[PDB]
Amino acid sequence: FVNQHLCXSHLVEALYLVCGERGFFYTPK
Amino acid sequence: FVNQHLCXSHLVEALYLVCGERGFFYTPK
Amino acid sequence: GIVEQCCTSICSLYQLENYCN
Amino acid sequence: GIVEQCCTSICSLYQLENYCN
Ligand SMILES: [Cl-]
Ligand SMILES: [Cl-]
């Protein structure tokens, strides 16, 4: 699921799944 | 959509929708 | 933190916005 | 930043992990 073009909510979904219990920062600018 | 119990991906979805182009930090601990 | 505030209890716009950059 | 790397171009695990806390 990660080695493709991931945009908007799709990108945030992948961060969520990869990061798990650590969480993440989403900084699109 | 925001004034309810939001857990896991549901919570991350609401942050994404509320925050828009700013993005956000998701720090579940 | 967020999970206590918005999952275990009812969320608010006010609090979500605290986590926007 | 992330959008250039993972939306306009193809993402990687390596880079996603850079955004985990
Ligand atoms: Cl997984
Ligand atoms: Cl909206």
Side-chain angles (χ1 to χ4, degrees), chain A residues 1-20 22-29, chain B residues 1-20 22-29, chain C, chain D:
Chain A
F1 56 107
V2 308
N3 296 105
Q4 61 182 127
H5 297 274
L6 299 167
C7 300
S9 72
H10 302 188
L11 179 54
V12 172
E13 180 162 296
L15 285 164
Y16 172 68
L17 288 176
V18 161
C19 299
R22 310 285 298 127
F24 57 91
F25 50 103
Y26 172 60
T27 53
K29 252 66 123 273
Chain B
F1 56 107
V2 308
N3 296 105
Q4 61 182 127
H5 297 274
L6 299 167
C7 300
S9 72
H10 302 188
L11 179 54
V12 172
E13 180 162 296
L15 285 164
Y16 172 68
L17 288 176
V18 161
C19 299
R22 310 285 298 127
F24 57 91
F25 50 103
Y26 172 60
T27 53
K29 252 66 123 273
Chain C
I2 196 178
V3 170
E4 297 70 40
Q5 306 309 139
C6 281
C7 169
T8 66
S9 320
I10 295 164
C11 207
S12 71
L13 181 62
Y14 183 97
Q15 298 184 77
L16 293 168
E17 290 197 345
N18 280 336
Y19 300 90
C20 300
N21 295 318
Chain D
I2 196 178
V3 170
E4 297 70 40
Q5 306 309 139
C6 281
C7 169
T8 66
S9 320
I10 295 164
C11 207
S12 71
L13 181 62
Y14 183 97
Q15 298 184 77
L16 293 168
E17 290 197 345
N18 280 336
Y19 300 90
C20 300
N21 295 318

Coordinates of all heavy atoms in Angstrom, one line a residue, unseen atoms left out:
Chain A
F1 N 0.9 -1.2 0.0 CA 0.0 0.0 0.0 C 0.9 1.2 0.0 O 0.4 2.3 -0.4 CB -1.1 0.0 1.2 CG -0.5 0.0 2.6 CD1 -0.4 1.0 3.4 CD2 0.1 -1.2 3.1 CE1 0.1 1.0 4.6 CE2 0.7 -1.3 4.4 CZ 0.7 -0.2 5.1
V2 N 2.2 1.1 0.4 CA 3.0 2.4 0.5 C 3.8 2.9 -0.7 O 4.0 4.0 -0.8 CB 3.9 2.5 1.7 CG1 3.1 2.1 3.0 CG2 5.1 1.6 1.6
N3 N 4.0 2.0 -1.7 CA 4.9 2.3 -2.7 C 4.2 2.7 -4.0 O 4.1 2.1 -5.0 CB 6.0 1.1 -3.0 CG 6.9 0.9 -1.8 OD1 6.6 -0.2 -1.1 ND2 7.8 1.6 -1.5
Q4 N 3.4 3.8 -3.8 CA 2.6 4.3 -4.9 C 2.3 5.8 -4.6 O 2.8 6.4 -3.6 CB 1.3 3.6 -5.0 CG 0.5 3.7 -3.6 CD -0.9 2.9 -3.6 OE1 -1.1 2.1 -2.7 NE2 -1.8 3.2 -4.5
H5 N 1.6 6.5 -5.5 CA 1.2 7.9 -5.3 C 0.0 7.9 -4.3 O -1.0 7.2 -4.5 CB 0.6 8.5 -6.6 CG 1.7 8.6 -7.7 ND1 2.5 9.6 -7.8 CD2 2.0 7.7 -8.7 CE1 3.3 9.4 -8.9 NE2 3.0 8.3 -9.4
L6 N 0.2 8.6 -3.2 CA -0.7 8.7 -2.0 C -1.0 10.2 -1.8 O -0.2 11.0 -1.4 CB -0.1 8.0 -0.8 CG 0.2 6.6 -0.9 CD1 1.1 6.2 0.2 CD2 -1.0 5.9 -1.0
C7 N -2.3 10.6 -2.1 CA -2.6 12.0 -2.0 C -3.8 12.3 -1.0 O -4.6 11.4 -0.8 CB -3.1 12.6 -3.3 SG -1.7 12.5 -4.6
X8 N -3.7 13.4 -0.4 CA -4.9 13.8 0.5 C -5.1 12.8 1.6 O -4.3 12.3 2.3 CB -4.4 15.1 1.1
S9 N -6.4 12.3 1.7 CA -6.8 11.4 2.8 C -6.1 10.0 2.6 O -5.9 9.4 3.6 CB -8.3 11.2 2.8 OG -8.8 10.5 1.7
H10 N -5.7 9.7 1.4 CA -5.0 8.5 1.1 C -3.6 8.5 1.8 O -3.1 7.4 2.3 CB -4.9 8.2 -0.4 CG -6.2 8.1 -1.1 ND1 -6.3 7.8 -2.4 CD2 -7.5 8.5 -0.7 CE1 -7.6 7.7 -2.8 NE2 -8.3 8.2 -1.8
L11 N -2.9 9.6 1.7 CA -1.7 9.8 2.3 C -1.8 9.8 3.8 O -1.0 9.1 4.6 CB -1.0 11.1 1.9 CG 0.3 11.6 2.4 CD1 1.4 10.5 2.2 CD2 0.6 12.8 1.7
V12 N -2.8 10.5 4.4 CA -3.0 10.4 5.8 C -3.3 9.0 6.3 O -2.8 8.6 7.3 CB -4.2 11.5 6.2 CG1 -4.5 11.3 7.6 CG2 -3.7 12.9 5.9
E13 N -4.1 8.3 5.6 CA -4.3 6.8 5.9 C -3.0 6.0 6.0 O -2.9 5.2 6.9 CB -5.3 6.3 4.9 CG -5.6 4.8 5.1 CD -6.9 4.3 4.4 OE1 -8.0 4.8 4.7 OE2 -6.6 3.5 3.5
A14 N -2.2 6.2 5.0 CA -0.9 5.5 5.1 C 0.0 5.9 6.2 O 0.5 5.0 6.9 CB -0.2 5.7 3.8
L15 N 0.1 7.1 6.5 CA 0.8 7.5 7.8 C 0.3 6.9 9.0 O 0.9 6.4 9.9 CB 0.8 9.1 7.9 CG 1.7 9.9 7.0 CD1 1.2 11.4 7.0 CD2 3.1 9.8 7.5
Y16 N -1.1 6.9 9.1 CA -1.8 6.3 10.2 C -1.4 4.8 10.4 O -1.0 4.4 11.5 CB -3.3 6.5 10.0 CG -4.1 5.7 11.1 CD1 -4.2 6.0 12.5 CD2 -4.9 4.6 10.7 CE1 -4.8 5.2 13.4 CE2 -5.6 3.8 11.6 CZ -5.6 4.2 12.9 OH -6.3 3.4 13.8
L17 N -1.5 4.1 9.3 CA -1.3 2.6 9.3 C 0.3 2.3 9.6 O 0.6 1.5 10.4 CB -1.7 2.0 7.9 CG -3.2 2.0 7.8 CD1 -3.5 1.5 6.4 CD2 -3.8 1.1 8.8
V18 N 1.1 3.1 9.0 CA 2.6 2.9 9.2 C 3.1 3.2 10.6 O 3.9 2.5 11.2 CB 3.4 3.7 8.1 CG1 4.9 3.9 8.5 CG2 3.3 3.1 6.8
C19 N 2.6 4.3 11.1 CA 3.0 4.9 12.4 C 2.4 4.2 13.6 O 3.0 4.4 14.7 CB 2.9 6.4 12.4 SG 3.9 7.2 11.1
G20 N 1.3 3.7 13.5 CA 0.6 2.9 14.6 C 0.5 3.8 15.9 O 0.1 4.9 15.8
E21 N 0.9 3.2 17.0 CA 0.6 3.8 18.3 C 1.5 5.0 18.6 O 1.2 5.8 19.5 CB 0.8 2.7 19.4 CG 2.2 2.6 20.0
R22 N 2.5 5.3 17.7 CA 3.4 6.5 17.8 C 2.6 7.8 17.4 O 2.9 8.9 17.8 CB 4.6 6.4 16.9 CG 5.5 5.1 17.0 CD 6.4 5.0 18.3 NE 7.4 6.1 18.4 CZ 7.5 6.8 19.5 NH1 6.6 6.6 20.5 NH2 8.4 7.8 19.6
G23 N 1.7 7.6 16.4 CA 1.2 8.7 15.7 C 2.2 9.4 14.8 O 3.3 8.8 14.6
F24 N 1.8 10.5 14.3 CA 2.6 11.2 13.3 C 2.3 12.6 13.1 O 1.4 13.1 13.8 CB 2.3 10.5 11.9 CG 0.8 10.5 11.5 CD1 0.3 11.6 10.8 CD2 -0.1 9.6 11.9 CE1 -1.0 11.8 10.4 CE2 -1.4 9.7 11.6 CZ -1.9 10.7 10.8
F25 N 3.1 13.4 12.4 CA 2.8 14.7 12.0 C 2.5 14.8 10.5 O 3.3 14.3 9.7 CB 3.8 15.7 12.5 CG 5.1 15.4 12.2 CD1 5.8 16.0 11.1 CD2 5.8 14.5 13.0 CE1 7.2 15.7 10.9 CE2 7.2 14.1 12.8 CZ 7.8 14.8 11.7
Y26 N 1.5 15.5 10.0 CA 1.1 15.7 8.7 C 1.2 17.1 8.4 O 0.4 18.0 8.9 CB -0.3 15.1 8.4 CG -0.9 15.4 7.1 CD1 -0.2 15.1 5.9 CD2 -2.0 16.2 6.9 CE1 -0.7 15.4 4.7 CE2 -2.5 16.5 5.7 CZ -1.9 16.2 4.6 OH -2.4 16.5 3.3
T27 N 2.2 17.5 7.6 CA 2.6 18.9 7.4 C 2.6 19.1 5.9 O 3.8 19.3 5.4 CB 4.0 19.1 8.0 OG1 4.9 18.1 7.5 CG2 3.9 19.0 9.5
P28 N 1.5 19.2 5.2 CA 1.4 19.4 3.7 C 2.0 20.7 3.2 O 2.3 20.8 2.0 CB -0.1 19.2 3.4 CG -0.7 19.7 4.7 CD 0.2 19.2 5.8
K29 N 2.0 21.7 4.1 CA 2.5 23.1 3.9 C 1.5 24.0 3.3 O 0.6 24.6 4.1 CB 3.8 23.2 3.1 CG 5.0 23.6 4.0 CD 5.3 22.5 5.0 CE 6.8 21.9 4.9 NZ 6.9 20.8 3.9
Chain B
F1 N -20.1 16.2 12.6 CA -19.2 15.0 12.6 C -18.3 15.1 13.8 O -17.7 14.1 14.2 CB -18.4 14.7 11.2 CG -17.5 15.9 10.7 CD1 -16.2 15.8 10.9 CD2 -18.1 17.1 10.3 CE1 -15.4 16.9 10.5 CE2 -17.3 18.1 9.9 CZ -15.9 18.0 10.0
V2 N -18.1 16.4 14.4 CA -17.0 16.4 15.4 C -17.4 16.2 16.8 O -16.6 15.8 17.7 CB -16.1 17.6 15.3 CG1 -15.6 17.9 13.9 CG2 -16.9 18.9 15.7
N3 N -18.8 16.3 17.1 CA -19.2 16.3 18.5 C -19.7 15.0 18.9 O -20.9 14.7 19.2 CB -20.2 17.5 18.8 CG -19.6 18.9 18.6 OD1 -20.0 19.5 17.5 ND2 -18.9 19.4 19.4
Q4 N -18.8 14.0 18.9 CA -19.1 12.6 19.2 C -17.8 11.9 19.5 O -16.7 12.5 19.6 CB -19.8 11.9 18.0 CG -18.8 11.9 16.8 CD -19.4 11.3 15.5 OE1 -19.4 11.9 14.4 NE2 -19.8 10.0 15.6
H5 N -17.9 10.7 19.9 CA -16.7 9.8 20.2 C -16.1 9.4 18.9 O -16.8 8.9 18.0 CB -17.2 8.5 20.9 CG -17.8 8.7 22.3 ND1 -17.1 8.8 23.4 CD2 -19.1 8.8 22.6 CE1 -17.9 8.9 24.4 NE2 -19.1 9.0 24.0
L6 N -14.9 9.8 18.7 CA -14.0 9.6 17.5 C -12.8 8.8 17.9 O -11.9 9.3 18.6 CB -13.7 10.9 16.9 CG -14.8 11.8 16.4 CD1 -14.4 13.2 16.2 CD2 -15.5 11.1 15.3
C7 N -12.6 7.5 17.4 CA -11.5 6.7 17.8 C -10.7 6.2 16.6 O -11.3 6.0 15.6 CB -12.0 5.5 18.6 SG -12.9 5.9 20.2
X8 N -9.4 6.1 16.9 CA -8.5 5.5 15.8 C -8.7 6.2 14.5 O -8.5 7.5 14.4 CB -7.2 5.5 16.4
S9 N -8.9 5.5 13.4 CA -8.9 6.2 12.1 C -10.0 7.2 12.0 O -9.9 8.1 11.2 CB -9.0 5.1 11.0 OG -10.3 4.5 10.9
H10 N -11.1 7.1 12.8 CA -12.2 8.0 12.8 C -11.7 9.4 13.3 O -12.2 10.4 12.8 CB -13.4 7.5 13.6 CG -13.9 6.2 13.1 ND1 -15.1 5.6 13.6 CD2 -13.4 5.3 12.2 CE1 -15.3 4.5 12.9 NE2 -14.3 4.2 12.1
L11 N -10.9 9.3 14.4 CA -10.3 10.5 14.9 C -9.4 11.1 14.0 O -9.4 12.4 13.8 CB -9.6 10.2 16.2 CG -8.9 11.3 17.0 CD1 -9.8 12.5 17.3 CD2 -8.4 10.6 18.3
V12 N -8.5 10.4 13.3 CA -7.6 10.9 12.3 C -8.3 11.6 11.2 O -7.9 12.6 10.7 CB -6.6 9.8 11.9 CG1 -5.8 10.3 10.7 CG2 -5.7 9.3 13.0
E13 N -9.4 10.9 10.7 CA -10.3 11.5 9.7 C -10.8 13.0 10.1 O -10.8 13.9 9.2 CB -11.4 10.6 9.3 CG -12.3 11.1 8.3 CD -13.2 10.0 7.6 OE1 -12.6 9.1 6.9 OE2 -14.3 10.1 7.9
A14 N -11.3 13.0 11.3 CA -11.8 14.3 11.8 C -10.7 15.4 11.9 O -10.9 16.5 11.4 CB -12.4 14.1 13.1
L15 N -9.6 15.1 12.3 CA -8.4 16.0 12.3 C -8.1 16.5 10.9 O -7.8 17.6 10.6 CB -7.1 15.4 13.0 CG -7.1 15.2 14.5 CD1 -6.0 14.2 14.9 CD2 -6.9 16.6 15.1
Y16 N -8.0 15.5 10.0 CA -7.7 15.8 8.6 C -8.8 16.8 8.0 O -8.4 17.8 7.4 CB -7.8 14.5 7.8 CG -7.7 14.8 6.3 CD1 -6.6 15.2 5.6 CD2 -8.7 14.5 5.5 CE1 -6.6 15.5 4.3 CE2 -8.8 14.7 4.1 CZ -7.7 15.2 3.5 OH -7.7 15.4 2.1
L17 N -10.1 16.5 8.3 CA -11.2 17.4 7.7 C -11.1 18.8 8.4 O -11.3 19.8 7.7 CB -12.5 16.7 7.9 CG -12.7 15.5 7.0 CD1 -13.9 14.8 7.3 CD2 -12.6 15.9 5.5
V18 N -11.0 18.8 9.7 CA -11.0 20.2 10.4 C -9.8 21.0 10.1 O -9.9 22.2 9.9 CB -11.0 19.8 12.0 CG1 -10.6 21.1 12.8 CG2 -12.4 19.3 12.3
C19 N -8.6 20.4 10.0 CA -7.3 21.1 9.8 C -7.0 21.6 8.4 O -6.2 22.5 8.3 CB -6.2 20.4 10.5 SG -6.4 20.2 12.3
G20 N -7.6 20.9 7.4 CA -7.4 21.2 6.0 C -5.9 21.4 5.6 O -5.1 20.5 5.9
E21 N -5.6 22.5 5.0 CA -4.3 22.7 4.3 C -3.2 22.9 5.3 O -2.0 22.8 4.9 CB -4.4 23.8 3.3 CG -4.0 25.2 3.8
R22 N -3.5 23.2 6.6 CA -2.5 23.3 7.7 C -1.9 22.0 8.1 O -0.8 21.9 8.6 CB -3.2 23.9 9.0 CG -4.1 25.1 8.9 CD -3.3 26.4 8.7 NE -2.4 26.8 9.8 CZ -1.1 27.1 9.6 NH1 -0.6 27.0 8.4 NH2 -0.3 27.4 10.6
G23 N -2.7 20.9 7.9 CA -2.3 19.7 8.6 C -2.4 19.7 10.1 O -2.9 20.6 10.7
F24 N -1.9 18.6 10.7 CA -2.0 18.4 12.1 C -1.0 17.5 12.7 O -0.3 16.9 11.9 CB -3.5 17.8 12.4 CG -3.7 16.5 11.6 CD1 -3.3 15.3 12.3 CD2 -4.2 16.4 10.3 CE1 -3.5 14.1 11.6 CE2 -4.3 15.2 9.7 CZ -4.0 14.1 10.4
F25 N -1.0 17.4 14.0 CA -0.2 16.4 14.7 C -1.1 15.4 15.4 O -2.0 15.9 16.1 CB 0.9 17.0 15.6 CG 0.5 18.0 16.4 CD1 0.3 17.7 17.8 CD2 0.3 19.3 16.0 CE1 -0.1 18.7 18.7 CE2 0.0 20.3 16.8 CZ -0.3 20.0 18.2
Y26 N -0.9 14.1 15.3 CA -1.6 13.1 15.9 C -0.8 12.4 16.9 O 0.2 11.6 16.4 CB -2.3 12.2 14.9 CG -2.9 10.9 15.4 CD1 -4.0 11.0 16.4 CD2 -2.5 9.7 15.2 CE1 -4.5 9.9 16.9 CE2 -3.1 8.6 15.7 CZ -4.1 8.6 16.6 OH -4.6 7.5 17.1
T27 N -1.0 12.5 18.2 CA -0.1 12.2 19.2 C -0.9 11.4 20.2 O -1.1 11.9 21.4 CB 0.5 13.4 19.9 OG1 -0.6 14.3 20.4 CG2 1.4 14.2 18.9
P28 N -1.3 10.2 19.9 CA -2.1 9.3 20.8 C -1.5 8.8 22.2 O -2.2 8.5 23.1 CB -2.5 8.1 19.9 CG -1.3 8.0 19.0 CD -1.0 9.4 18.7
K29 N -0.1 8.9 22.1 CA 0.8 8.6 23.2 C 1.1 7.1 23.3 O 2.0 6.5 22.6 CB 0.4 9.1 24.6 CG 1.2 10.3 25.0 CD 1.1 11.5 24.1 CE 0.6 12.7 24.9 NZ -0.9 12.8 25.0
Chain C
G1 N -4.5 12.9 26.7 CA -4.3 13.7 25.5 C -5.5 13.4 24.6 O -6.7 13.1 25.1
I2 N -5.3 13.4 23.3 CA -6.4 13.5 22.4 C -7.3 12.3 22.5 O -8.5 12.3 22.2 CB -5.9 13.7 20.9 CG1 -7.1 14.1 20.0 CG2 -5.2 12.5 20.3 CD1 -6.7 14.4 18.6
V3 N -6.8 11.1 22.7 CA -7.6 10.0 22.8 C -8.6 10.0 24.0 O -9.8 9.6 23.8 CB -6.7 8.7 22.8 CG1 -7.6 7.5 23.1 CG2 -6.0 8.4 21.5
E4 N -8.0 10.4 25.1 CA -8.9 10.6 26.3 C -10.0 11.6 26.1 O -11.2 11.4 26.5 CB -8.1 11.0 27.6 CG -7.1 9.8 27.9 CD -6.0 9.5 26.8 OE1 -5.3 10.5 26.3 OE2 -5.7 8.3 26.7
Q5 N -9.6 12.7 25.4 CA -10.6 13.8 25.1 C -11.6 13.6 24.1 O -12.7 14.1 24.1 CB -9.9 15.1 24.9 CG -8.9 15.5 26.0 CD -9.4 15.5 27.4 OE1 -8.7 15.1 28.4 NE2 -10.7 15.8 27.6
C6 N -11.2 12.8 23.0 CA -12.1 12.7 21.8 C -12.6 11.3 21.5 O -13.6 11.2 20.8 CB -11.3 13.2 20.6 SG -11.3 15.0 20.6
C7 N -12.0 10.2 22.1 CA -12.4 8.9 21.9 C -13.2 8.3 23.1 O -14.3 7.8 22.9 CB -11.2 8.1 21.5 SG -11.4 6.2 21.5
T8 N -12.5 8.3 24.3 CA -13.0 7.8 25.5 C -14.1 8.8 26.0 O -15.0 8.4 26.7 CB -11.9 7.4 26.5 OG1 -11.2 8.5 26.9 CG2 -10.9 6.6 25.9
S9 N -14.0 10.1 25.7 CA -15.1 11.1 25.9 C -15.5 11.8 24.6 O -14.8 11.6 23.6 CB -14.5 12.2 26.8 OG -13.7 11.7 27.9
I10 N -16.4 12.7 24.6 CA -17.0 13.3 23.4 C -16.0 14.5 22.9 O -15.6 15.3 23.7 CB -18.4 13.8 23.6 CG1 -19.3 12.6 23.9 CG2 -19.0 14.5 22.4 CD1 -20.7 12.9 24.4
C11 N -15.6 14.4 21.7 CA -14.9 15.4 21.1 C -15.5 16.8 20.9 O -16.7 16.9 21.1 CB -14.3 14.8 19.8 SG -12.7 15.5 19.1
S12 N -14.7 17.8 20.6 CA -15.2 19.2 20.3 C -14.3 19.7 19.2 O -13.1 19.4 19.1 CB -15.1 20.0 21.5 OG -13.8 20.5 21.9
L13 N -14.9 20.7 18.5 CA -14.1 21.5 17.5 C -13.0 22.2 18.1 O -11.8 22.3 17.6 CB -15.0 22.3 16.6 CG -14.3 23.2 15.6 CD1 -13.6 22.3 14.5 CD2 -15.3 24.1 15.0
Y14 N -13.2 22.8 19.3 CA -12.3 23.5 20.0 C -11.0 22.7 20.2 O -9.9 23.2 20.1 CB -13.0 23.9 21.3 CG -12.2 24.7 22.2 CD1 -12.3 26.1 22.1 CD2 -11.1 24.2 22.9 CE1 -11.4 26.9 22.9 CE2 -10.2 25.0 23.6 CZ -10.4 26.3 23.5 OH -9.5 27.1 24.3
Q15 N -11.2 21.5 20.7 CA -10.1 20.7 21.0 C -9.4 20.2 19.7 O -8.2 20.3 19.7 CB -10.4 19.5 21.9 CG -10.9 20.0 23.3 CD -11.1 18.8 24.3 OE1 -10.1 18.2 24.9 NE2 -12.3 18.4 24.4
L16 N -10.2 19.7 18.7 CA -9.5 19.3 17.5 C -8.6 20.3 17.0 O -7.5 20.1 16.5 CB -10.5 18.8 16.5 CG -11.2 17.5 16.7 CD1 -12.3 17.3 15.8 CD2 -10.2 16.3 16.6
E17 N -9.0 21.6 16.9 CA -8.2 22.7 16.4 C -6.9 22.9 17.1 O -5.9 23.4 16.5 CB -9.0 24.0 16.2 CG -10.0 23.9 15.1 CD -10.5 25.2 14.5 OE1 -10.3 26.3 15.2 OE2 -11.1 25.3 13.4
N18 N -6.9 22.5 18.3 CA -5.6 22.6 19.1 C -4.5 21.8 18.5 O -3.3 22.0 18.8 CB -5.8 22.2 20.5 CG -6.4 23.4 21.4 OD1 -6.3 24.5 21.0 ND2 -7.0 23.0 22.3
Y19 N -4.9 20.7 17.7 CA -3.9 19.8 17.1 C -3.6 20.2 15.6 O -2.8 19.5 15.0 CB -4.3 18.4 17.3 CG -4.4 17.9 18.6 CD1 -5.6 18.0 19.3 CD2 -3.3 17.6 19.3 CE1 -5.7 17.7 20.6 CE2 -3.4 17.2 20.6 CZ -4.6 17.3 21.3 OH -4.5 16.9 22.6
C20 N -4.2 21.3 15.0 CA -3.8 21.7 13.7 C -2.5 22.5 13.8 O -2.1 23.1 14.8 CB -4.9 22.6 13.2 SG -6.5 22.1 13.0
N21 N -1.7 22.3 12.7 CA -0.4 23.1 12.7 C -0.8 24.6 12.4 O -2.0 25.0 12.0 CB 0.5 22.6 11.5 CG 0.9 21.2 11.7 OD1 1.3 20.8 12.8 ND2 0.8 20.4 10.7
Chain D
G1 N 8.0 18.9 0.5 CA 7.8 18.1 1.7 C 7.0 16.8 1.3 O 7.0 16.3 0.2
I2 N 6.1 16.4 2.2 CA 5.5 15.1 2.1 C 4.7 15.0 0.8 O 4.5 13.9 0.2 CB 4.8 14.6 3.3 CG1 4.5 13.1 3.3 CG2 3.5 15.5 3.6 CD1 3.8 12.6 4.5
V3 N 4.0 16.0 0.5 CA 3.1 15.9 -0.7 C 3.9 15.7 -2.0 O 3.5 14.9 -2.9 CB 2.2 17.2 -0.7 CG1 1.5 17.2 -2.0 CG2 1.2 17.1 0.4
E4 N 5.0 16.5 -2.1 CA 6.0 16.4 -3.3 C 6.5 15.0 -3.3 O 6.6 14.4 -4.4 CB 7.0 17.4 -3.2 CG 6.3 18.8 -3.4 CD 5.5 19.3 -2.1 OE1 5.9 19.1 -0.9 OE2 4.5 20.0 -2.5
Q5 N 6.9 14.4 -2.2 CA 7.5 13.1 -2.1 C 6.6 11.9 -2.3 O 7.0 10.9 -2.8 CB 8.3 13.0 -0.9 CG 9.4 14.1 -0.6 CD 10.3 14.4 -1.9 OE1 10.7 15.5 -2.2 NE2 10.6 13.3 -2.6
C6 N 5.4 12.0 -1.8 CA 4.5 10.9 -1.7 C 3.2 10.9 -2.6 O 2.6 9.9 -2.8 CB 4.1 10.6 -0.2 SG 5.5 9.9 0.6
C7 N 2.8 12.1 -3.0 CA 1.6 12.3 -3.9 C 2.0 12.6 -5.4 O 1.5 12.0 -6.2 CB 0.8 13.4 -3.2 SG -0.6 14.1 -4.2
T8 N 2.8 13.7 -5.5 CA 3.3 14.1 -6.8 C 4.3 13.1 -7.4 O 4.4 12.9 -8.6 CB 3.6 15.6 -6.9 OG1 4.7 15.9 -6.1 CG2 2.6 16.4 -6.3
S9 N 5.0 12.4 -6.5 CA 5.9 11.3 -6.8 C 5.6 10.1 -6.0 O 4.7 10.2 -5.1 CB 7.4 11.7 -6.4 OG 7.7 13.1 -6.8
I10 N 6.2 9.0 -6.2 CA 5.9 7.7 -5.6 C 6.5 7.7 -4.1 O 7.6 8.0 -3.9 CB 6.4 6.5 -6.4 CG1 5.6 6.5 -7.7 CG2 6.1 5.2 -5.7 CD1 6.2 5.6 -8.8
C11 N 5.6 7.4 -3.1 CA 6.0 7.2 -1.8 C 6.9 6.0 -1.5 O 7.1 5.2 -2.3 CB 4.7 7.2 -1.0 SG 4.8 7.8 0.8
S12 N 7.5 6.0 -0.3 CA 8.3 4.9 0.3 C 8.0 4.8 1.7 O 7.7 5.8 2.5 CB 9.8 5.2 0.0 OG 10.4 6.2 0.8
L13 N 8.3 3.6 2.3 CA 8.2 3.4 3.7 C 9.2 4.2 4.5 O 8.9 4.8 5.5 CB 8.3 1.9 4.0 CG 8.2 1.5 5.5 CD1 6.9 1.9 6.2 CD2 8.5 0.0 5.6
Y14 N 10.4 4.3 3.9 CA 11.4 5.0 4.4 C 11.0 6.5 4.8 O 11.3 7.0 5.8 CB 12.6 5.0 3.4 CG 13.8 5.7 3.9 CD1 14.8 4.9 4.5 CD2 13.9 7.1 3.9 CE1 15.9 5.6 5.0 CE2 14.9 7.7 4.5 CZ 15.9 7.0 5.1 OH 17.0 7.6 5.6
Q15 N 10.4 7.1 3.8 CA 10.0 8.5 4.0 C 8.8 8.6 4.9 O 8.9 9.4 5.8 CB 9.7 9.2 2.6 CG 11.0 9.3 1.7 CD 10.7 10.1 0.5 OE1 10.7 11.4 0.5 NE2 10.5 9.4 -0.6
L16 N 7.8 7.7 4.7 CA 6.6 7.8 5.7 C 7.1 7.8 7.1 O 6.6 8.5 8.0 CB 5.6 6.8 5.4 CG 4.8 7.0 4.1 CD1 4.0 5.7 3.9 CD2 3.8 8.2 4.2
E17 N 8.1 6.9 7.5 CA 8.5 6.7 8.8 C 9.2 8.0 9.4 O 9.2 8.1 10.6 CB 9.3 5.4 9.0 CG 8.5 4.2 9.0 CD 9.2 3.0 9.6 OE1 10.4 3.0 9.9 OE2 8.5 2.0 9.9
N18 N 9.7 8.8 8.5 CA 10.3 10.0 8.9 C 9.3 10.9 9.6 O 9.6 11.8 10.3 CB 10.9 10.8 7.8 CG 12.3 10.2 7.5 OD1 13.0 9.6 8.3 ND2 12.7 10.4 6.3
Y19 N 8.0 10.7 9.3 CA 6.9 11.6 9.9 C 6.2 10.9 11.0 O 5.3 11.5 11.6 CB 5.9 12.0 8.8 CG 6.4 12.8 7.7 CD1 7.0 12.1 6.6 CD2 6.7 14.1 7.9 CE1 7.6 12.9 5.6 CE2 7.3 14.8 6.9 CZ 7.7 14.2 5.8 OH 8.3 15.1 4.8
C20 N 6.6 9.7 11.6 CA 6.1 9.1 12.7 C 6.7 9.9 13.9 O 7.9 10.4 13.9 CB 6.4 7.7 12.8 SG 5.9 6.7 11.5
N21 N 6.0 10.0 15.0 CA 6.5 10.6 16.2 C 7.5 9.5 16.9 O 7.4 8.3 16.6 CB 5.4 11.0 17.3 CG 4.5 12.0 16.7 OD1 4.9 13.0 16.2 ND2 3.2 11.8 16.9
Ligands
CL1 CL 0.0 -3.0 9.1
CL2 CL -15.5 20.7 5.9

